XYZ file of C-alpha atoms in Angstrom:
11
model
C 90.604 107.384 89.656
C 89.432 110.424 87.691
C 89.775 108.172 84.644
C 91.869 105.165 83.572
C 95.336 106.429 82.639
C 98.474 104.263 82.593
C 101.614 106.413 82.840
C 100.829 109.803 81.304
C 101.157 111.675 84.592
C 104.589 110.192 85.290
C 107.430 112.041 83.591
């Protein structure tokens, strides 16, 4: 993963 998001991309 390019980072450690959670659900920011989803929308």
